[PDB]
Design a protein around this ligand. Structure first.
Ligand SMILES: Cc1cc2nc3c(=O)[nH]c(=O)nc-3n(C[C@H](O)[C@H](O)[C@H](O)COP(=O)(O)OP(=O)(O)OC[C@H]3O[C@@H](n4cnc5c(N)ncnc54)[C@H](O)[C@@H]3O)c2cc1C
Ligand SMILES: Cc1cc2nc3c(=O)[nH]c(=O)nc-3n(C[C@H](O)[C@H](O)[C@H](O)COP(=O)(O)OP(=O)(O)OC[C@H]3O[C@@H](n4cnc5c(N)ncnc54)[C@H](O)[C@@H]3O)c2cc1C
Lengths: 309, 317
């Protein structure tokens, strides 16, 4: 099994494949990096000349020409936005910028309630549109202020796009990983399905043909005996989320959707997250704070992906 | 150990083969497969007036027309294939399909006049249709009231992909699904080997030979029939229309088989390539660069061509 590692999107990517030799794996390293750089140059909020950031810097309310991938990513992210009751909101940009959770200048003082209200007045899923045509795709906003942030959906795409690259290179047996987003196919070098482990206050899943993603870290919470001020923002309040929910793991058809649902479920909190998961029948595992210890919950749909042996 | 299921949908046949479940659950899967295919039929059919597509076609509103997520993505995929085939496969070719009587419509009393053809193809065009995607809502939009969208060459492909999604949904990772000419597969046989899709090659004397491919994780679709050509000693006036001439295609290209990431794309591409013809198709296939197998007529016999990308899918055992 040839393993490859590198850096993309301010984080790490990992690819493992079975079927090719060391020389062919070194050539795959270059092809992977090239594609991930292109995905970075398409979606990054940290690069002013990226395709998204060019759209964000534009004040135009007219249709804004984009690639097929960009249109499909935003479309996918808008749909998750509606299914999470607006919890996962890609227009949360101005709020992200206000608290200084992106590339921009750190706030001199803690944002006032007025500053918070003014910033979320620039947010809204209603304000963004995708227009698909024969040989042309467009993003459209009805508010010049609108600032789109695809951070919670980018790694997921990168992982899924990396899986397709694996396919067109003729490789059927693989594990692809970008950040916390992961996707898998076929058997590893030892004839077993790829081993994705999830930390329990350890469970092993088989997610071949699916995507997995985790938001939050129990491992960090246990070590640091506490939690960062969250970089995940609740669109309803305009403030960082304040929940006892520590970590959320989602198994979905694509890694992009797994990545998107992660944040949405974190925004909703334990009770509302479980309710939407039951209603829409999703594969979700979550860790929450319980006094001085922890409690775990996994949906019936999540249980089906566990490996017994 | 393989459970095999068959039935009818969309005026053609569907086949599903599944490893990993018993007979009692395969029977239950039959019901779930049929229900979903009936729904897909009720979404995409041109032969059913109360279908979602036909409701859009009978509407002359130029404002955004509310459709399902699937409908929006199907059309999005179809328009893109339209552009990448240089307009060859055109989902707005409806009016012309209806004029020649290739759809559900009443058979023409006389052969279409050059003027009738011009008037019909003035109601066609890829630039006349767009898709609008929003949070919680999707829309189709036309700028021409007479526009008629026909998704015949993309429906079976979608149905095959949607069926493959249901297999994953039911926890089945070892399957072969097909609707009409479109097909998709995953995993191993009951004998523990990749699903074997057979593609007919021309016969030399007495030895009938065919190529075997592994298309696991991909979609495959064949347009045209070599066996029918060989037996009948010729082909019928084609139901595939060239949107440029407004006429049935008269090419020596007998059959086209495409392997693509999805069955919908394979379904959409083989019509586009059939419209383009041998030379033009081969040029696109090399530049694109697609996984294609084609059979063309060569006088009394036939010859075959397959792209380098197609050859990678061949099983060498
Ligand atoms: C294309 C791309 C390029 C990147 N480039 C860089 C880089 O150059 N340098 C760098 O340091 N990091 C970069 N990142 C960030 C990268 O994802 C890192 O892995 C990240 O810093 C670590 O993850 P996280 O803990 O911030 O969680 P994340 O997965 O990044 O989630 C937190 C982020 O989600 C967004 N968010 C907050 N609330 C919501 C909401 N309610 N709905 C939707 N989204 C919300 C915010 O932007 C927040 O920063 C990039 C990300 C992408 C997708
Ligand atoms: C959703 C759905 C429902 C159907 N319901 C019925 C039914 O109820 N009864 C029935 O008899 N048949 C029905 N059909 C068709 C059926 O599936 C058969 O497979 C088909 O009639 C036989 O295949 P064919 O030879 O026409 O090839 P096809 O794959 O059907 O391709 C030919 C068809 O494509 C269309 N076409 C022609 N030129 C172009 C062009 N250049 N660009 C794009 N498209 C073009 C035409 O409509 C033509 O009929 C349905 C098809 C679909 C997708």
């Amino acid at each position: 099994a040839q393993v490859l590692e590198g850096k993309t999107m301010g984080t790490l990517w990992r690819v493992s494949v079975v079927g090719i030799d060391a020389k062919r794996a070194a050539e795959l390293q270059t092809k992977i990096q090239t594609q991930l750089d292109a995905d970075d140059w398409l979606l990054s909020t940290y690069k002013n000349d990226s395709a998204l950031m060019r759209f964000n810097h534009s004040r135009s309310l007219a249709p804004w020409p984009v690639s097929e991938a960009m249109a499909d990513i935003v479309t996918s992210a808008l749909r998750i936005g509606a299914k999470t009751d607006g919890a996962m909101d890609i227009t949360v940009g101005p709020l992200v910028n206000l608290w200084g959770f992106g590339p921009d200048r750190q706030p001199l003082h803690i944002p006032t309630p007025a500053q918070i209200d003014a910033a979320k007045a620039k947010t809204g899923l209603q304000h963004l549109q995708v227009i698909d045509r024969a040989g042309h795709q467009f993003l459209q906003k009805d508010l010049p202020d609108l600032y789109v942030d695809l951070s919670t959906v980018g790694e997921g795409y990168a992982a899924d796009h990396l899986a397709r690259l694996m396919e067109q290179e003729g490789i059927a047996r693989y594990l692809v990983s970008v950040g916390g987003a992961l996707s898998s196919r076929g058997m590893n070098a030892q004839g077993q399905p790829w081993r994705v482990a999830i930390q329990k206050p350890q469970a092993i899943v088989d997610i071949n043909g699916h995507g997995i993603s985790t938001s939050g870290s129990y491992r960090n919470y246990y070590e640091l005996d506490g939690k960062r001020v969250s970089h995940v923002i609740d669109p309803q309040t305009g403030r960082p989320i304040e929940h006892n929910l520590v970590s959320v793991t989602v198994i979905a058809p694509t890694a992009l959707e797994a990545d998107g649902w992660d944040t949405g479920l974190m925004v909703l909190g334990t009770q509302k997250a479980q309710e939407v998961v039951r209603r829409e029948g999703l594969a979700v595992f979550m860790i929450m704070k319980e006094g001085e210890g922890f409690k775990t919950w996994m949906s019936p749909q999540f249980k089906t992906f566990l490996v017994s042996d």
